[PDB]
Amino acid sequence: SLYIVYHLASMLGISVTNSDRMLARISQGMEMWESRALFADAQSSVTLPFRHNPYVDVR
Amino acid sequence: PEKERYQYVVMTSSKDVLLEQSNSSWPWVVYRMRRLTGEIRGRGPSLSAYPTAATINQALE
């Protein structure tokens, strides 16, 4: 949710943010919460294996 | 009895019998090197090797 808030603010700020430095910081907040949101979603379960393993499947 | 132990028949796929005999032996001798219990056909060392061969051939391809 917080990642979407920053990302949407980044899109609006293209036209309405006064300072380039301020827009850069908003975009930095977008990227920061994107990684944290991705980690939080991903770490809850194990990583699934590949479905295609040629050197094993050929046996 | 021993002299009649092996019953031998030659016929066609439409069940037309061409020859019937009874002898003390039959033409065939069957070889096995090793055998898994419950199976009549054997399993030899080249059968043990083929999964390894399959991996090698895939690697070379």
Side-chain angles (χ1 to χ4, degrees), chain A residues 12-58:
Chain A
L12 295 171
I14 290 174
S15 56
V16 301
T17 290
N18 308 141
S19 168
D20 287 337
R21 249 130 63 250
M22 183 58 71
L23 222 206
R25 293 201 192 85
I26 291 173
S27 298
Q28 286 174 24
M30 173 193 70
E31 299 174 12
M32 187 264 285
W33 285 111
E34 183 177 10
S35 293
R36 300 194 60 173
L38 280 167
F39 170 81
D41 180 77
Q43 54 77 48
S44 60
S45 307
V46 301
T47 300
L48 299 183
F50 298 150
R51 293 215 291 189
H52 309 101
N53 301 280
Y55 295 171
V56 176
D57 298 339
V58 73

Side-chain angles (χ1 to χ4, degrees), chain B residues 2 9 13 15 20-21 23-25 31 33-34 38 42 47-48 50 52-53 55 57 59 61:
Chain B
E2 331 84 3
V9 171
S13 64
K15 270 74 67 57
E20 293 182 358
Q21 287 182 353
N23 309 280
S24 57
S25 62
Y31 302 159
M33 283 175 69
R34 281 230 57 186
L47 199 148
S48 297
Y50 92 79
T52 300
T55 291
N57 278 275
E61 188 188 59

Side-chain angles (χ1 to χ4, degrees), chain B:
Chain B
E2 331 84 3
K3 60 187 57 174
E4 314 278 290
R5 185 167 178 80
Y6 293 83
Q7 228 64 214
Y8 183 71
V9 171
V10 183
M11 63 198 305
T12 75
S13 64
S14 60
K15 270 74 67 57
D16 297 331
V17 175
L18 304 177
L19 177 63
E20 293 182 358
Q21 287 182 353
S22 56
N23 309 280
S24 57
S25 62
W26 59 14
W28 305 282
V29 182
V30 178
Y31 302 159
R32 291 89 49 103
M33 283 175 69
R34 281 230 57 186
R35 191 178 64 87
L36 172 63
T37 176
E39 297 185 330
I40 309 161
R41 302 178 188 265
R43 292 173 180 257
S46 294
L47 199 148
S48 297
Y50 92 79
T52 300
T55 291
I56 299 179
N57 278 275
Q58 189 59 61
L60 288 193
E61 188 188 59

